[PDB]
Amino acid sequence: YKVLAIETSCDDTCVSVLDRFSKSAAPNVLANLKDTLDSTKAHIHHQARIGPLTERALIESNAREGIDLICVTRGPGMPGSLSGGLDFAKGLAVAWNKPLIGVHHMLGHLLIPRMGTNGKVPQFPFVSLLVSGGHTTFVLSRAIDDHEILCDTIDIAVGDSLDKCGRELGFKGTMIAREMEKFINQDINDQDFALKLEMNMLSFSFSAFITALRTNLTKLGKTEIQELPEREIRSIAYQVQESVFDHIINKLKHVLKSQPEKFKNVREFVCSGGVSSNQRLRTKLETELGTLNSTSFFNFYYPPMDLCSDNSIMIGWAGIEIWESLRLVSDLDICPIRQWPLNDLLSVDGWRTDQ
Amino acid sequence: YKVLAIETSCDDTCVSVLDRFSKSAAPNVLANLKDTLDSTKAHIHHQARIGPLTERALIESNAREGIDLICVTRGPGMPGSLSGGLDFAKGLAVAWNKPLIGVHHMLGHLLIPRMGTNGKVPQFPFVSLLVSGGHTTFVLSRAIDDHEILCDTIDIAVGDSLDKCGRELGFKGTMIAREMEKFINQDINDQDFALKLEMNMLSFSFSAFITALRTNLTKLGKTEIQELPEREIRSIAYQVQESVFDHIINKLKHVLKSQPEKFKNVREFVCSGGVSSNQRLRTKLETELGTLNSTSFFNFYYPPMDLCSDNSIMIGWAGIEIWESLRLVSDLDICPIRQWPLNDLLSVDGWRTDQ
Ligand SMILES: [Ca+2]
Ligand SMILES: [Ca+2]
Ligand SMILES: [Zn+2]
Ligand SMILES: [Zn+2]
């Protein structure tokens, strides 16, 4: 019971060998990642990486003959890109004569925080916020097959919104979003508070913030970010970050108080993704949700950045949960599904019982 | 030394397990084929077939652990379609820890008639005519890496030309071309001979024959094929087939007599493909080329229709020739090449020495 896992949906080519010692613990043997170089197609990249990225991951891992289950991403994404990992996984499966479990990409993200505790700590009736550079979704899980989208982005994601409006302020590094947070947190008190930069049910909107900041900048004193002093650009950065997060909080507060019947048994909140790394977002979440009466008490869990960002360990974990708790295996004639819905996880063709 | 071979370039999904008993003989263990149903994308078809088409081909064959070399089509064709076989072959290779040899599709066709005699009877300095529904090429091989295109189609192929102009005559079956030959050969003497239907260096042209037949039909008596008697449509079918073949012969006669230095050591002619099944084409080839003085004497070889039409056995054979006579193996980072030239066989990236 050594799980070979693959992630080939976006730009990250991931290969990870897991070790399931018993049905109570799951330490990770090996984990590889190769991202697309940018100033080369994603499908061609994955197709050229997967092969040599698995042999090295098998040479460095326990054994090449010790693999018992092959997990791969059948999930949402580019068909051509994820066919690279899928057809390769079929090749491993046929050659070793072992099962294949085609995993939903988003299911990996939602199930990943359960691996460390062997699906115990984030107990089945739970609620989750997926704040990344690509996602912005508020999901309620009732079981591994049941998932309810309570609030999702109709515009762009937080990562993009904070990176786009952050670029207007002057920041231009590798991870634009966190550099702004580090600038605000270098000296939180030294700000020009005088610079008052002041700006349906199941939806989030972010594409307006960049447009609203530019109008706020043209109305107020100066627009030239290069000439602007450090204290003034810090009161702007604080206020933009405050408004972006106030919108998320206000929509989570709206969801919880509107239908508390769905949240009667939720005892754990999971904030996963790139933006979860923000200490203000964390403190805002824990402050507001913990004081409201109608809202049920929570226990906030912030997973590591390695597991949060697209990796293969999550596919290997979600596959473990499906092979064990549902006892299902994907058919060998499996094909990529571009816009595979999460509720349409077991409705679509390809499932075969192992029980 | 059991070769797993794959063909996923066009519409035929092929998987074949070969048995190399010694470096003197090569009997074929298993061979599978699944073609695209037509009134479903070719890439999606190959991607869904390859997996289950290999497991059954491995269950019915000798063993699943007995495979020593993995041959696959890297050759010309649809990138998405042939990625299905390639990524799958990588999966087998990585899993079994065995070599991979990415084969040129056209090299399979040219090398296939050597398998039965273990590369002896069609001796190295040879000339070949590839007359199929997709090809119409006159190739000279000097070694397995050296190939000279002496005459090729600039329009459409013989198979298409005979099927398109045959359809104008009334035939509408599964294999249109051969049905016309069978109609001409049912009673070759009963024809209306009075119906005289009368119609640069390295090139063949066929798209003109259909247009020239229609003009010949409008000029002569009647066009309505339904009302037309069987004897008259037989003199048309004979004359169209005679003109199509006379053009091929005249261009082969031109090539040989223009540069006889290239043909000083050629002792064998190989006519392979769908149109090679025609007895008149065969008799025309053997008559004309055998009476001309400047042209070197030939020994005509007509391979079976199974090996001629797109299959995986040829990839497994061409791979055997490359692994043995050249001692080369393709790298695991291999990717599909859409318009891979035959002279650019070893010039392109991906080759690694096994010696
Ligand atoms: Ca099926
Ligand atoms: Ca290379
Ligand atoms: Zn993702
Ligand atoms: Zn072909």
Numbering used by the authors:
A (entry chain A), B (entry chain A): 33 to 71, 80 to 239, 251 to 406
Publication passage describing the model:
N6-threonylcarbamoyladenosine (t6A) is one of the 15 universally conserved tRNA modifications found in all three domains of life. With the sole exception of bacterial initiator tRNAfMet, t6A is present at position 37 of the anti-codon stem loop of all tRNAs with ANN recognizing anticodons (N being any nucleotide). This modification serves to strengthen the codon–anticodon interaction and promote translational fidelity by the ribosome. Toward this end, we show that yeast Sua5 and Qri7 (the mitochondrial paralogue of Kae1) are sufficient for t6A biosynthesis in vitro. In summary, the eukaryotic t6A biosynthesis system functions first through Sua5, which generates TCA using its adenylation function and then secondly through Qri7, which binds to TCA to conjugate the threonyl-carbamoyl moiety onto directly bound tRNA substrates.
To shed light onto the structural basis for the unique functional properties of Qri7, we solved the structure of yeast Qri7. Qri7 exhibits the prototypical bilobal structure with its catalytic region sandwiched between subdomains I and II. Crystal structures of Kae1 orthologues (like ASKHA fold proteins in general) display variability in interlobe closure, and the Qri7 structure is notable in adopting the most open configuration reported to date for a Kae1 orthologue. Projection of conservation onto the Qri7 structure identified a large contiguous surface emanating from the catalytic cleft. A portion of the conserved surface was accounted for by the expected binding sites of TCA and phosphate coordinating metal ions. The binding of acceptor substrate (tobramycin) in the evolutionarily related TobZ crystal structure identifies these unaccounted for conserved surfaces at the tips of subdomains I and II as the possible tRNA substrate-binding surface. Application of crystallographic symmetry to the Qri7 monomer structure revealed a dimer configuration with a large (2087.5 Å2) hydrophobic buried surface, which is partially conserved across Qri7 orthologues. Remarkably, the Qri7 dimerization surface is the same surface used by archaeal and eukaryotic Kae1 proteins to bind Pcc1, a dimerization module within KEOPS and the same surface used by the bacterial orthologue YgjD to bind YeaZ. We confirmed that Qri7 forms homodimers in solution with a dissociation constant of 60 nM by equilibrium analytical ultracentrifugation. The R104A and K130A mutants displayed a dimerization dissociation constant of 3.0 ± 0.3 μM and 2.5 ± 0.2 μM, respectively. These results confirm that Qri7 forms homodimers in solution through the same binding mode revealed in the crystal structure.
